[PDB]
Design a protein around this nucleic acid. Structure first.
Ligand SMILES: Nc1ccn([C@@H]2O[C@H](COP(=O)(O)CP(=O)(O)OP(=O)(O)O)[C@@H](O)[C@H]2O)c(=O)n1
Lengths: 60, 257, 690, 57, 58, 95, 110
RNA sequence: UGCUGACU
DNA sequence: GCCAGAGACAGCGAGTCAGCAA
DNA sequence: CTGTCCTCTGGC
């Protein structure tokens, strides 16, 4: 029960994209849980610090 | 493509040219950026622009202009590209924010940076069903071809200090793009007679065909000169007179016959 | 060794010796090792490789009347040349001395024993005579094998000959080593003409050239599409077919879609465009209708049934297996191993797409191998045997479709009705040089495959068995980048020996110390040894993060994930085994370890090649002094001094045997080549052959 | 070539075998000194780069 | 100084220009600077670069 | 309905061992007991380590004797990584 | 560095084996609700079949099955060997036993 | 005509 | 009606000598 | 392998 947000987590296959509130039971083994997950998947990412930047590259 | 206008040899012109060189080089959003911070259907974006210490020196830019650019051009080209993807998928801070969201229905509120662009992010959201992926790809492929401001056709200037020994005092403002009219405004800083370009179609459109004949001849001569070869001018005269016979610079190839 | 007893300075007291004309007891042994790659390849192709070739040969079942008949080829045997039938007298053998006097082919008899059954309870083993296949001169199926120089003079032969050629109409065709991309190794390429393959394809993709037991080759391309999705292009019978990945991965393995996913995100489990695009591969085209291995095999079976020309009474699930067996990853028997190999080639396209890896130049010898005379011979033999089956049963189905019960009376009169085929097709490939095949043999070239070997001089002749042709198509190209003499052909190709006109840079020659690998070994105790050394099997418990681990491959089969701080010691241990001939490591395995840094260097990982067509060259292994053999890709990660006093303590892992090892055999006949300018040593090499 | 003139040639060839670090370093605009391995890394980065115009420099 | 495309000889994929030279070696010898003459011949590594140049010429 | 695993006819359920109190859940949950997963080459003879002090952290070379020949085994000890094999033990609670 | 005295009490005939399970789709947060049943082949005369085993795990929603034979049997069960060590913290003694690893997978039939 | 060598 | 999407489409040095197979 | 056509196609 720790496969994340795109797989049945008790069956196996992958779920489909969200439309109605309930977890979109897969075409196989339609068991449902967590209609809408608690937190929207948040992503922390940025770019590089050599070429795009003129900062971080005063000397070195 | 290139250009070469001599600099007029006056004390005022020498001073104005520094600003001219710094005025025609292209400054692009990507050349002024540190790194983006994208959070994701509610997609936030903080640009985090560079300090002026090492880019204002030779680009002639200011932070209000740069940021105003994001509000009016980048933050709407962003929705333009979002639609490009989603069509085939299946006291004063206040007025600026308000006019900006007057024009678009997705943004919510950006930021303000009263101290040298400290933290300037934006927030979007498409709540029903959109392909939530690492859209950083889009907002990075777009933050490269996004240029603050540039003269059409010119990519960079440079003043090759000396070009003569006889009258060593000559200065030349060479360029690596081609826009003839966008130099006509500096007839007092630069000598617009003595203007030269290797294009031969642009010369033929600003000065005529009898002026493109001589550019053709000089181009062939300078091509042969780099190897020490020297074809007699009487041959290049005939070639240039035949090419430009009927009023246009016509190619010497299968479509010219 | 094999380069000892090399003369220290030349002598002149060998001429003017009391024994100058007496034919010697055994042949020279340095001249013999020149055509050795041409003969040791054929020796396999005709005896040990022919059995394997016929073993694949799926039994050709088809419908007669209301009956289904099965024909399998149990063995095929090529016999030394001999007087035709017994209609001749006094000597059964036939020696190459004639067919040069007369103008004829030195051809041996190819005969197989087919076994035809009707439902599997009625069967009879008939022995048909397929045809005639040409024979090499000193090739184990020739009559001049095991003859000393004195007995080789009473048959009219050179007393110093090394055959390595064919006599097709008395002309001595010399089929020469062509250059192939590589075998059983995924090469990540950036080719801009790939985005024309479809609507959203990019200019990124890993190509793999698969060879099974030297009888079959196939080329498969994994393409990156802009959506983050990967496609698979396969070619069957010269037609290109595109299957989304996911259709292939679900068919090969009966695993959940999360387990397939956990595999394609092994080293980049923090990236989110990838995690999202793996799911769009598994769900977008596979949760659309097929979610069990059988339904995927059934859907794939129906779309491809028409062009795979499968039997009509075959379930669609059986027609899918036919596609996977004959078109994708020929080299691997398992379907689980075929899954792990398609997953590492994808894990690599994702790194090339995200600029985490450097495109592999297809024109560097690092990513190149040679096509020997035995690979072309068997790959044509196998295809022609399959064609013979097909033609005999075309005749079968077409004659009468009539009550086979009594028709078992003319069964042999039937098989012979199409056994009249296999002879002339084979001589065309040898007399003309160009290839007429339904599948081009995974080759890319269909002409100039065999060439005339002309004895104008013995320096023109000896250079036909050391030539390596980049390809005959590259003689027609605007850009000249396959003519660059890169620094990776140091010791493997001669810098000076290249034709100096239209063929320049395209026709190269091997150095004197370089050699082609031709032996075949067991390589079964190697996967069990790698695990003792420190590797952890593909199944699990890597002990680190899948990013601080090297993906171990051994001949197309991913053993899997040697830890990052155990990879160096493992590579050094494996190199010590091959040098001292311990374990069963072939003396010529290439232990490569492409290190991983944060830079966009070549994709990291510990490879271990032992295949039969790579080029190797000897170098004195310092720290052991035991004459190691290194390969084209293994030589890029090691320092090899040339002269002593150039050897250092930490640097100089290896050392070269002689200082002139870099030069070819002919370029070693030019006197003082060091004091002449180089374009003059290139003309001397071409003038010594006229 | 005269002897007593090949000695100068040999000494100049010996001197020429020490001009790589300074050349590359002062072309990467690196700290003038104190970096002997940062220079190799900067050269490697410039070599595996995409633009490849800091390598031609 | 050997020059192939207007540039020094190319490096391998590992950062060495020739199997004899350490990766990213600073010496000019590793970049095609031949100090040998045809009077007293040139060593093997220099022979290699000279052949590269003479071949690109053709 | 969950299609319930159906045992093939040539297989029979193995009863628990009531003669096994060692791998009993009770024995394994004792405050002084720790469980370790060990992975070794297929030809590894565990008896060669009898009496020898295997490390509980880091990397160490351990010498073993098998059939008169000295073997040295690099032993790597680590922190369990999420997703590791779970040990099954007989439980009286589970019928 | 902390060390343990190694002892292979192991299996009396080697017939005895422990049982390790690994799930192909990840972890079970709290599997306390799982019932495992180990099945063995009835054929004890065939050396090939006598070591064939099936492990079945039943939940309320799905079934998992692992086997040590056939495609589901994976390479790690042989190329490498698995053991379980039981460490007595007080004595510093580690008892080592043979283990069999089962890769578990979900159950459905047409 | 073709194709494989070769010459300036 | 304005101008990108392409997707065909055409061009690719001069002369010379052989042999071999169809 | 590049540059113009240049004939659609397609969207606007
Ligand atoms: N494919 C070709 C090859 C050659 N030629 C012609 O032959 C001449 C001499 O070739 P060459 O190769 O001997 C050059 P050369 O300067 O004489 O050589 P050197 O430095 O050793 O003295 C060329 O300049 C061309 O006129 C041609 O038309 N097509």
């Amino acid at each position: 029960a720790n496969t994340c947000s795109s797989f049945q987590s008790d069956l196996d296959f992958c779920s489909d994209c969200g439309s109605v509130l309930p977890l979109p039971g897969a075409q196989d083994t339609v068991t449902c849980i967590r209609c809408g997950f608690n937190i929207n998947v948040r992503d922390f990412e940025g770019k590089v610090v050599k070429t795009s930047v003129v900062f971080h590259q005063l000397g070195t | 493509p290139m250009m070469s206008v001599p600099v007029l040899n006056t004390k005022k012109a020498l001073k104005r040219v520094k600003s001219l060189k710094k005025q025609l080089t292209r400054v692009c959003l990507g050349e002024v950026l540190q790194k983006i911070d994208v959070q994701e259907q509610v997609y936030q974006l903080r640009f985090q622009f560079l300090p002026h210490a090492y880019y204002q020196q030779e680009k002639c830019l200011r932070p209000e202009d740069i940021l105003r650019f994001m509000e009016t051009r980048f933050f709407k080209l962003l929705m333009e590209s979002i639609k490009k993807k989603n069509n085939k998928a299946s006291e004063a801070m206040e007025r600026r924010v308000q006019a900006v969201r007057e024009i678009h229905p997705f943004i919510d509120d950006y930021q303000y940076d009263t101290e040298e662009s400290l933290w300037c992010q934006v927030t979007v959201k498409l709540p029903l069903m959109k392909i939530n992926f690492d859209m950083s790809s889009l907002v990075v492929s777009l933050a490269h071809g996004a240029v603050i401001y540039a003269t059409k056709g010119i990519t960079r200037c440079l003043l090759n200090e000396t070009t003569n020994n006889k009258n060593e005092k000559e200065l030349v403002l060479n360029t690596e793009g081609i826009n003839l009219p966008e130099l006509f405004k500096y007839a007092e800083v630069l000598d617009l007679r003595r203007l030269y370009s290797n294009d031969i179609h642009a010369i033929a459109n600003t000065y005529g065909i009898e002026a493109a004949l001589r550019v053709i001849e000089k181009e062939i001569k300078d091509v042969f000169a780099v190897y020490g070869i020297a074809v007699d001018p009487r041959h290049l005269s005939l070639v240039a007179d035949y090419m430009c016979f009927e009023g246009v610079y016509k190619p010497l190839n299968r479509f010219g016959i | 060794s094999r380069w000892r007893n090399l003369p220290s300075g030349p002598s002149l007291k060998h001429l003017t010796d009391p024994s100058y004309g007496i034919p010697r007891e055994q042949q020279k042994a340095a001249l013999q090792e020149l055509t050795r790659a041409h003969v040791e390849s054929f020796n396999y192709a005709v005896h040990e490789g022919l059995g394997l070739a016929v073993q694949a040969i799926p039994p050709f079942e088809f419908a007669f009347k209301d009956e289904r008949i099965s024909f399998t080829i149990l063995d095929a045997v090529i016999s030394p040349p001999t007087v035709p039938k017994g209609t001749i007298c006094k000597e059964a053998n036939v020696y190459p001395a004639e067919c040069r006097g007369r103008r004829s082919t030195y051809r041996g008899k190819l005969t197989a024993d087919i076994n035809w059954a009707v439902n599997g309870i009625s069967k009879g083993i008939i022995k048909q005579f397929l045809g005639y296949v040409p024979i090499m001169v000193k090739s184990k199926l020739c009559n001049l094998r095991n003859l000393p120089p004195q007995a080789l003079i009473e048959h009219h032969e050179e007393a110093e000959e090394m055959g390595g050629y064919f006599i097709i109409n008395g002309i001595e065709k010399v089929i020469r080593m062509l250059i192939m991309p590589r075998r059983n190794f995924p090469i990540a390429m950036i080719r801009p003409k790939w985005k024309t393959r479809g609507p959203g394809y990019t200019q990124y993709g890993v190509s793999m050239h698969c060879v099974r037991e030297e009888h079959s080759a196939v080329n498969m391309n994994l393409h990156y599409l802009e959506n983050g999705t990967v496609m698979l292009n396969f070619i069957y019978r010269k037609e290109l077919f595109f299957l989304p990945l996911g259709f292939a991965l679900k068919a090969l393995v009966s695993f959940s879609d999360y387990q397939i996913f956990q595999e394609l995100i092994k080293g980049k489990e923090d990236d989110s465009f990838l995690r999202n695009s793996v799911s769009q591969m598994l769900r977008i085209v596979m949760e659309e209708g097929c979610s069990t291995q059988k339904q995927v095999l059934n859907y794939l079976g129906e779309c491809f049934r028409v062009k795979l020309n499968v039997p009509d009474w075959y379930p669609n699930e059986q027609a899918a297996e036919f596609l996977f067996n004959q078109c994708i990853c020929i080299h691997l028997k398992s379907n689980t191993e075929k899954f792990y190999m398609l997953c590492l080639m994808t894990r690599k396209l994702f790194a090339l797409a995200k600029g985490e890896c450097m495109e592999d130049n297809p024109d560097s010898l690092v990513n190149q191998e040679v096509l020997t005379p035995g690979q072309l011979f068997l790959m044509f033999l196998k295809e022609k045997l399959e064609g013979w089956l097909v033609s005999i049963k075309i005749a079968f189905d077409k004659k009468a479709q009539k009550t086979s019960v009594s028709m078992n009376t003319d069964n042999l009169m039937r098989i012979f009705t199409m056994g009249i085929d296999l002879t002339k097709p084979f001589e065309y490939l040898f007399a003309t040089g160009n290839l007429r095949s339904k599948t081009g043999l995974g080759l890319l070239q269909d002409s100039g495959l065999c060439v005339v070997a002309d004895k104008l001089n013995f320096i023109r002749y000896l250079s036909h068995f050391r030539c390596v042709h980049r390809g005959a198509d590259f003689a027609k190209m605007r850009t000249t980048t396959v003519r660059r003499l890169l620094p990776e052909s140091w010791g493997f190709l001669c810098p000076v020996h290249t034709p100096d006109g239209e063929p320049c840079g395209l026709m190269n020659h091997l150095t004197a110390v370089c050699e082609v690998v031709t032996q075949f070994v067991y390589t079964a105790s190697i996967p069990a040894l790698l695990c003792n050394l420190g590797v952890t099997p593909i199944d699990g418990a890597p002990h680190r993060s899948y990013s601080e681990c090297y993906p171990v491959l051994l001949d197309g089969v991913m053993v899997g994930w040697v830890d990052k701080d155990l990879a160096p010691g493992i590579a050094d241990s494996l190199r010590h085994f091959k040098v001292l001939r311990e374990k069963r490591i072939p003396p010529w395995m290439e232990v490569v370890l492409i290190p991983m840094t944060g830079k966009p260097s070549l994709y990291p990982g510990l490879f271990l090649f032992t295949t039969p067509c790579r080029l190797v060259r000897p170098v004195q292994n310092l720290a052991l002094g035991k004459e190691e053999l290194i390969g084209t890709m293994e030589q890029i990660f090691m320092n090899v001094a040339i002269f002593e006093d150039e050897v250092f303590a930490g640097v100089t892992t290896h050392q070269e045997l002689f200082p002139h090892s870099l030069l070819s055999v002919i370029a070693n006949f030019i006197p003082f080549s060091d004091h002449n300018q180089s374009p003059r040593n290139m003309y001397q090499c071409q003038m010594g052959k006229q | 070539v005269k002897p007593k003139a090949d000695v100068k040639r040999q000494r100049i060839i010996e001197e020429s075998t020490h001009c790589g670090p300074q050349a590359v370093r002062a072309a990467l605009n690196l700290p003038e000194a104190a970096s002997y391995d940062e220079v190799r890394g900067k050269w490697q980065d410039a070599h595996l780069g995409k633009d490849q115009r800091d390598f031609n420099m | 100084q050997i020059e192939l495309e207007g540039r020094r000889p190319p490096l391998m994929a590992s950062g060495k220009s020739l199997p004899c030279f350490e990766p990213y070696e600073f010496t000019p010898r590793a970049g095609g600077f031949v100090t040998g003459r045809f009077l007293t011949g040139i060593k093997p590594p220099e022979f290699f670069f000279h052949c590269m140049a003479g071949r690109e010429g053709l | 309905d969950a299609a319930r695993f159906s045992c093939p006819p040539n297989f029979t359920a193995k009863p628990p061992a009531s003669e096994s109190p060692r791998f009993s859940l009770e024995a394994l949950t004792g405050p002084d007991t720790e469980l370790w997963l060990i992975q070794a080459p297929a030809d590894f003879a565990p008896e060669c380590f009898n009496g020898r002090h295997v490390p509980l952290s880091g990397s160490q070379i351990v010498k073993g004797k098998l059939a008169g020949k000295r073997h040295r085994y690099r032993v790597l000890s680590s922190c369990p990584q999420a997703g590791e094999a779970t040990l099954l033990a007989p439980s009286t609670e589970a019928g | 560095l902390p060390s343990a005295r190694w002892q292979y009490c192991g299996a009396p005939d080697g017939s005895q084996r422990a049982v390790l399970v690994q799930f192909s789709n990840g972890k079970l947060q709290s599997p306390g609700n799982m019932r495992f049943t180990l099945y063995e082949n009835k054929d004890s005369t065939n050396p090939r079949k006598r070591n064939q085993r099936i492990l079945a795990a039943e939940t309320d929603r799905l079934s998992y099955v692992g086997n040590n034979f056939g495609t589901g049997a994976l390479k790690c069960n042989t190329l490498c060997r698995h053991f379980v060590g039981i460490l007595n913290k007080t004595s510093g003694q580690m008892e080592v036993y043979d283990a069999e690893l089962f890769n578990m997978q979900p159950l459905f039939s047409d």
